[PDB]
Design an enzyme around this catalytic site. Structure first.
Site, PDB file in Angstrom:
ATOM      1  N   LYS A   1       0.835  -1.198   0.000  1.00 56.68           N
ATOM      2  CA  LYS A   1       0.000   0.000   0.000  1.00 56.68           C
ATOM      3  C   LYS A   1       0.868   1.244   0.000  1.00 56.68           C
ATOM      4  O   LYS A   1       1.869   1.316   0.726  1.00 56.68           O
ATOM      5  CB  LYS A   1      -0.887   0.028   1.268  1.00 56.68           C
ATOM      6  CG  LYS A   1      -1.779   1.252   1.379  1.00 56.68           C
ATOM      7  CD  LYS A   1      -2.471   1.334   2.745  1.00 56.68           C
ATOM      8  CE  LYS A   1      -3.503   2.420   2.742  1.00 56.68           C
ATOM      9  NZ  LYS A   1      -4.453   2.360   3.911  1.00 56.68           N
TER      10      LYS A   1
ATOM     11  N   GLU B   1      -9.138  12.346  12.517  1.00 56.25           N
ATOM     12  CA  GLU B   1      -8.291  11.209  12.926  1.00 56.25           C
ATOM     13  C   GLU B   1      -7.255  11.498  14.063  1.00 56.25           C
ATOM     14  O   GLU B   1      -6.545  12.453  14.001  1.00 56.25           O
ATOM     15  CB  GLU B   1      -7.627  10.678  11.661  1.00 56.25           C
ATOM     16  CG  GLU B   1      -6.787   9.377  11.785  1.00 56.25           C
ATOM     17  CD  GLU B   1      -6.226   8.916  10.450  1.00 56.25           C
ATOM     18  OE1 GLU B   1      -5.236   8.090  10.426  1.00 56.25           O
ATOM     19  OE2 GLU B   1      -6.804   9.342   9.417  1.00 56.25           O
TER      20      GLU B   1
ATOM     21  N   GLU C   1     -12.396  10.480  -4.661  1.00 61.07           N
ATOM     22  CA  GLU C   1     -12.087  10.418  -3.204  1.00 61.07           C
ATOM     23  C   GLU C   1     -11.363  11.661  -2.702  1.00 61.07           C
ATOM     24  O   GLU C   1     -11.819  12.325  -1.780  1.00 61.07           O
ATOM     25  CB  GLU C   1     -11.291   9.153  -2.821  1.00 61.07           C
ATOM     26  CG  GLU C   1     -11.189   8.974  -1.283  1.00 61.07           C
ATOM     27  CD  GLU C   1     -10.763   7.587  -0.898  1.00 61.07           C
ATOM     28  OE1 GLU C   1     -11.365   6.602  -1.342  1.00 61.07           O
ATOM     29  OE2 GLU C   1      -9.795   7.427  -0.121  1.00 61.07           O
TER      30      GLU C   1
ATOM     31  N   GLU D   1      -7.837  -1.876   2.674  1.00 59.19           N
ATOM     32  CA  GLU D   1      -7.223  -0.574   2.900  1.00 59.19           C
ATOM     33  C   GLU D   1      -7.128  -0.267   4.377  1.00 59.19           C
ATOM     34  O   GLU D   1      -6.153   0.268   4.805  1.00 59.19           O
ATOM     35  CB  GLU D   1      -8.068   0.505   2.223  1.00 59.19           C
ATOM     36  CG  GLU D   1      -7.423   1.799   1.960  1.00 59.19           C
ATOM     37  CD  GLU D   1      -8.323   2.619   1.042  1.00 59.19           C
ATOM     38  OE1 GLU D   1      -8.859   2.033   0.085  1.00 59.19           O
ATOM     39  OE2 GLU D   1      -8.487   3.828   1.278  1.00 59.19           O
TER      40      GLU D   1
ATOM     41  N   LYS E   1     -12.524  14.729  -0.124  1.00 59.06           N
ATOM     42  CA  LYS E   1     -11.664  15.124   1.003  1.00 59.06           C
ATOM     43  C   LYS E   1     -11.251  16.601   0.937  1.00 59.06           C
ATOM     44  O   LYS E   1     -11.274  17.319   1.942  1.00 59.06           O
ATOM     45  CB  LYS E   1     -10.400  14.224   1.056  1.00 59.06           C
ATOM     46  CG  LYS E   1     -10.692  12.852   1.553  1.00 59.06           C
ATOM     47  CD  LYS E   1      -9.641  11.869   1.152  1.00 59.06           C
ATOM     48  CE  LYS E   1      -9.919  10.558   1.843  1.00 59.06           C
ATOM     49  NZ  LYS E   1      -8.878   9.546   1.511  1.00 59.06           N
TER      50      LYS E   1
HETATM   51 MG    MG Z   1      -9.326   5.492   0.403  1.00 53.67          MG
END
Ligand code: MG
Length: 430
Positions: free
Chosen positions: A190, A240, A416, A284, A420
């Protein structure tokens, strides 16, 4: 605050005659009435001294403003060395940022700290000297004299001058394509790859007003804002946590995997169900649990990873697996260096992902995907610097990133990172 300036002055005149001409630190705590609502952000914005740091817990029940740096730290490592020479003030807090590379930071020992927990606040003044506390008492007086009363904080009135993506869509596709191709080599599992969007405006951007606009709309997010000085800032509204530490009890989370939010609750919930069931996003996220659990093995005790939950935000939703452990040592450099950057943010294996990013990202993330918050001997809490912006005079750089894993579709990943980037961008372009 009128009254507290006064009380601080009264205090300081007295101290500056009495306090010894010896090195050290005093910490002065005054209760801050929240009988009357106080907007700390717009207060902070009124001030002309720097640097300034704003921070709000994601739950909204803890909020801080700091103004002026008695000392500046270039790393959390350096800040902790300092705290540890002052065990007598276990609640002494240093505030600010870790860059993407966790070994670089910009953290401060605040001259003035307003901190709220709940419906209750405290103003802390600290006195520190290497030579004379008596001396620093008079500097403290001049600092106070710098204080200006609260002015209203204008909303943003911005005219877009210029726009540029790094990379753009065309360049993004070849990048994601390259990344997946590389992951298909079987070694890299990743990589998280980001886009910087440089937005120029007809005038300078009021970062504080940007921050306020985000606090108004970007709910359930930590808010962090550093004014390096009058022309330069870094802020954002991130969902987060990197870590939170109470003595030895350590909290972190594997937060990775995204779907759109929808303003309609059922649709949001159905979209979240799709996410929970989605192999690609599941993987993910699982790659973050693997990285975090491995990274924490040598330095912690029994680890609890909770089942995934969907976390819902203004434009985006995420899978999130809380993680609880106990540290062997009450050490924030162990927390930061073991954890940052996690596979939510850089990738896995850590080395190959860091190298791919160094090689192919058309910009330096700098503060983006580092961390923001505070440490003290007793407790600390940092969030991840996602959903964030660097302001340079009349340019706002927006950052957004997408974790790349087997099966990433570039066009979906572009979508995506746009969702964001939107949480901040929509504040600038109405
Ligand atoms: Mg993602």
């Amino acid at each position: 605050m009128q009254s507290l300036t006064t009380a601080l002055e009264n205090l300081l005149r007295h101290l500056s005659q009495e306090i010894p001409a010896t090195p050290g630190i005093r910490v002065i705590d005054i209760p801050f009435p929240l009988k009357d609502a106080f907007d700390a952000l717009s207060w902070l914005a009124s001030q002309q001294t720097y640097p300034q740091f704003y921070w709000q817990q994601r739950n909204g029940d803890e909020e801080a403003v700091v103004l002026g740096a008695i000392t500046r730290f270039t790393s959390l490592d350096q800040a902790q060395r300092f705290l540890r020479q002052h065990p007598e003030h276990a609640d002494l807090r240093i505030w600010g940022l870790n860059a993407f590379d966790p070994s670089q930071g910009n953290l401060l020992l605040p001259r003035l700290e307003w901190r709220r927990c709940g419906g209750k606040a405290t103003l802390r003044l600290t006195l520190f000297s290497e030579s004379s506390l008596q001396h620093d008492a008079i500097q403290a007086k001049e600092f106070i004299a710098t204080l200006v009363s609260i002015k209203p904080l204008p909303g943003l009135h911005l005219t877009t001058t210029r726009e540029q993506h790094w990379p753009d869509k065309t360049g993004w596709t070849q990048l994601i394509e390259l990344a997946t191709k590389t992951i298909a080599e079987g070694e890299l599992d990743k990589v998280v790859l980001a886009r910087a969007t440089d937005l120029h405006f007809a005038s300078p951007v009021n970062a504080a007003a940007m921050m306020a606009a985000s606090r108004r709309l970007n709910l359930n997010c930590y808010h962090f804002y550093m004014a390096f000085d009058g022309e330069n800032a870094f802020l954002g509204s991130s969902p987060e946590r990197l870590w939170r530490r109470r003595d030895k009890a350590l909290r972190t989370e594997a937060l990775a995997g995204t779907v759109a939010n929808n303003p309609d609750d059922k649709q949001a919930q159905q979209l979240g169900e799709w996410l929970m069931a989605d192999d690609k996003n599941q993987r993910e996220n699982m790659l973050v649990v693997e990285d975090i659990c491995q990274r924490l093995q040598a330095d912690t005790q029994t680890l609890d990873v909770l089942p995934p939950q969907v976390l819902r935000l203004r434009k985006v939703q995420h899978l999130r697996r809380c993680i609880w452990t106990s540290l062997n040592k009450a050490d924030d450099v162990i927390c930061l260096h073991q954890l940052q950057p996690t596979a939510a943010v850089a990738g896995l294996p850590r080395d190959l992902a860091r190298q791919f990013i160094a090689r192919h990202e058309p910009f330096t993330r700098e503060w983006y995907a580092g961390s923001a918050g505070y440490l003290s001997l007793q407790q600390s809490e940092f969030c991840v610097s996602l959903r964030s912006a660097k302001i340079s005079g009349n340019v706002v750089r927006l950052y957004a990133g997408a974790g790349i894993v087997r099966g990433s579709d570039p066009e979906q990943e572009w979508q995506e990172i746009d969702n964001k980037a939107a949480g901040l961008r929509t504040l600038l372009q109405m």
